[PDB]
From Swiss-Prot, chain A:
Reported modifications of this chain: N-acetylated by NAT1.
Protein family per UniProt: Belongs to the proteasome subunit p55 family.
Section of the entire sequence shown: 150 to 442 of 445
GO BP annotation list: proteasome-mediated ubiquitin-dependent protein catabolic process; protein deneddylation
Protein name, per record: 26S proteasome regulatory subunit RPN5
Curated annotation (Swiss-Prot), chain B:
Modifications the protein undergoes after translation, according to the UniProt entry: N-acetylated by NAT1.
Protein known as: 26S proteasome subunit RPT4
Family as reported in the entry's similarity comment: Belongs to the AAA ATPase family.
UniProt gene name: RPT4
Entry binding sites for ATP: 47-54
Function (record text): The 26S proteasome is involved in the ATP-dependent degradation of ubiquitinated proteins. The regulatory (or ATPase) complex confers ATP dependency and substrate specificity to the 26S complex.
Domain of life: Eukaryota
Species name: Saccharomyces cerevisiae (strain ATCC 204508 / S288c)
From Swiss-Prot, chain C:
Name listed for the protein in its UniProt record: 26S proteasome regulatory subunit RPN9
Record's miscellaneous remark: Present with 12400 molecules/cell in log phase SD medium.
GO CC aspect terms: cytosol; nucleus; proteasome complex; proteasome regulatory particle, lid subcomplex; proteasome storage granule
Single annotated GO MF: structural molecule activity
Family per record: Belongs to the proteasome subunit S11 family.
Known role: Acts as a regulatory subunit of the 26S proteasome which is involved in the ATP-dependent degradation of ubiquitinated proteins.
GO biological process: proteasome assembly; proteasome-mediated ubiquitin-dependent protein catabolic process; ubiquitin-dependent protein catabolic process
Keywords from the UniProt entry: Proteasome
From Swiss-Prot, chain D:
Residues making up the signal peptide according to the UniProt record: none
Domain of life: Eukaryota
Family: Belongs to the proteasome subunit S9 family.
Subunit architecture: Component of the lid subcomplex of the 19S proteasome regulatory particle complex (also named PA700 complex). The 26S proteasome consists of a 20S proteasome core and two 19S regulatory subunits.
Chain's role: Component of the lid subcomplex of the 26S proteasome, a multiprotein complex involved in the ATP-dependent degradation of ubiquitinated proteins. In the complex, RPN6 is required for proteasome assembly.
UniProt modification remark: N-acetylated by NAT1.
Protein name per Swiss-Prot or TrEMBL: 26S proteasome regulatory subunit RPN6
Record's miscellaneous remark: Present with 16800 molecules/cell in log phase SD medium.
Impact when changing residue 51 to P: In rpn6-2; temperature-sensitive mutant that shows defects in proteasome assembly when incubated at 37 degrees Celsius
Gene name for this UniProt entry: RPN6
Species, as recorded: Saccharomyces cerevisiae (strain ATCC 204508 / S288c) (Baker's yeast)
């Protein structure tokens, strides 16, 4: 009949009154039913509370065939409205190593291509290096290696081919199928350019000592006002530490080192030389067998 | 086993009083957690003598089977130095 | 297929660690020959699927001589040859030559 | 519309101004004073007076 609020109001008072976690297959249905009505109602905060209660109960309980049906949608739908990509790759990776009866040996492999792409939209992470050594990522779909080849380009990024791909090839970028399904061209590209700019700015802080403002406009392909916009935002977030020098038209990316910090690494260098001397000391006697032969 | 639920008959109205404070929380403690009430700890038995108040203790020991401890009032009163406080 | 691993080859006989050098059994050698059978004939999709079980077996169980390593490097030498990556093929050929 | 709470926002004019300068000083020092007045939208003498106050 096209009634949203009328169906949610009768089930709203029940969600707390359902069960003491006695039933198994039945408890999964009622808790995940209100999450479908809350999303259609226009509020994702109501389904967030229910998501924390059902996750801790099923943590030690194995998921059957009638369970994982709704865990492929309601879990990743809440993070869509929140626009937080750090949690998107967490639920998609958690369903990998499970029993995986619904996970195909063919159709599910291209889904991993989106998971690797979702780490780009997120502020890096600890899950990037884990997908490099995966066996299924190096075979079958060639786009698995294409998104993986971009992972090795994080530190080496010159931004030469990045605007080329963004203007030409967008298989997983503006068109989603097996993960998000797609929304709009401006939704995925809003945070896309923000991360690609952040890819070079993180390398500069860890590599380049200082760069002129005229050179930053050639790489990032921005103007004078747009260049300092993304740079100043990363400083307030406690990520990139850089001192922009306007009169010299440069930016100082070298972090200041105190007198104690310079002498700190000097103590490690002295202890390091004693490690090499210790290594060479035991290699003389070891290699002496071949000399005295 | 000697006295059972059949020998304590006639107290049926007062027998369900103990089943709620003993049999109910031990068999299904989660019921009190759903409503939010706290499980009752102590239970007082009073009345005229000879009504079977002692038989309520023997009837539970021969049915539930849990380990029980009989604590008479005059058994813990042994005194040397602060002895009754230690026995409790 | 008539032999495979630990069917007809294993009754009273001990484990010589496949066929790498001199005498040996057919347990781990046939699994290595099948990996190179589809590698030099069919595509590389079915070749690596059975190659990972051979690589994990070598890392879990090995022997003193290098006879098994050279036979294992010979399988990977033909795997990276048909691919477009010459960096992994370069390091693979160094272990095979040694 | 409330005159009781109006005195608070009048005091926040200098507080939020000093808070807005925190976003301007994000690239540490070596910034142009004239470039600061263009972002905040105030006179040069008005900005130089507030910077010396902090």
């Amino acid at each position: 009949e096209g009634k949203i609020d009328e169906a949610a109001d009768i089930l709203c008072e029940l969600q707390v009154e359902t069960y003491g976690s006695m039933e198994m297959s039945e408890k999964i249905q009622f808790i995940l039913e209100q999450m479908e009505l809350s999303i259609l109602k226009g509020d994702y905060s109501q389904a967030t509370v229910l998501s924390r209660k059902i996750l801790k109960k099923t943590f030690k309980n194995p998921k059957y065939e009638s369970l994982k049906l709704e865990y492929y949608n309601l879990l990743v739908k809440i993070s869509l409205h929140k626009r937080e990509y750090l949690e998107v790759a967490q639920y998609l990776q958690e369903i990998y190593q499970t029993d995986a009866i619904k996970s195909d040996e063919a159709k599910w492999k291209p889904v991993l291509s989106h998971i690797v792409y979702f780490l780009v939209l997120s502020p890096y992470g600890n899950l990037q290096n884990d997908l490099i050594h995966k066996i299924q990522n190096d075979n079958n779909l060639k786009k698995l290696e294409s998104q993986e080849s971009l992972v090795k380009l994080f530190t080496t990024n010159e931004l030469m081919r990045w605007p080329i791909v963004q203007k030409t090839y967008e298989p997983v970028l503006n068109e989603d199928d097996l993960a998000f399904g797609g929304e709009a061209n401006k939704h995925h590209w809003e945070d896309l350019q923000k991360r690609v700019i952040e890819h070079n700015l993180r390398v500069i802080s860890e590599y380049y000592s200082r760069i002129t403002l005229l050179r930053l406009n050639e790489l990032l392909d921005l103007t004078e006002s747009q260049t300092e916009t993304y740079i100043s935002d990363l400083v307030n977030q406690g990520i990139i530490y850089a001192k922009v020098n306007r009169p010299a038209k440069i930016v100082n990316f070298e972090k200041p080192k105190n007198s104690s910090q310079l002498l700190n690494e000097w103590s490690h260098n002295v202890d390091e030389l004693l490690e090499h001397i210790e290594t060479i000391g035991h290699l003389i006697t070891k290699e002496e067998i071949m000399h005295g032969l | 086993g000697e006295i059972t639920f059949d020998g304590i008959g006639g107290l049926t109205e007062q027998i369900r009083e103990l089943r709620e404070v003993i049999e109910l929380p031990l068999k299904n403690p989660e019921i009190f957690q759903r409503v939010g009430i706290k499980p009752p700890k102590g239970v007082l038995l009073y009345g005229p003598p000879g009504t079977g108040k002692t038989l309520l203790a023997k009837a539970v020991a021969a049915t539930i089977g849990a380990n029980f401890i009989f604590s008479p009032a005059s058994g813990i009163v042994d005194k040397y130095i602060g002895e009754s406080a230690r026995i409790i | 297929d008539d032999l495979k691993a630990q069917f007809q080859e294993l009754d009273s006989k001990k484990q010589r660690n496949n066929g790498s050098k001199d005498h040996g059994d057919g347990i781990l050698l046939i699994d290595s020959e099948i990996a190179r059978t589809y590698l030099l004939k069919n595509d590389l999709v079915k070749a690596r699927d059975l190659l990972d079980d051979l690589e994990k077996t070598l890392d879990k169980k090995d022997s003193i001589p290098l006879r098994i390593t050279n036979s294992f490097y010979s399988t990977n030498s033909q795997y990276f040859k048909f691919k477009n990556d010459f960096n992994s093929f370069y390091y693979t050929s160094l272990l095979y030559l040694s | 519309g409330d005159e009781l709470t109006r005195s608070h926002f009048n005091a926040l004019y200098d507080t939020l101004l000093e808070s807005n300068l925190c976003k301007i000083i994000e690239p540490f020092e070596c910034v142009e004073i004239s470039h600061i007045s263009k972002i905040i939208g105030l006179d040069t003498q008005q900005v130089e007076g507030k910077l010396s106050q902090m």
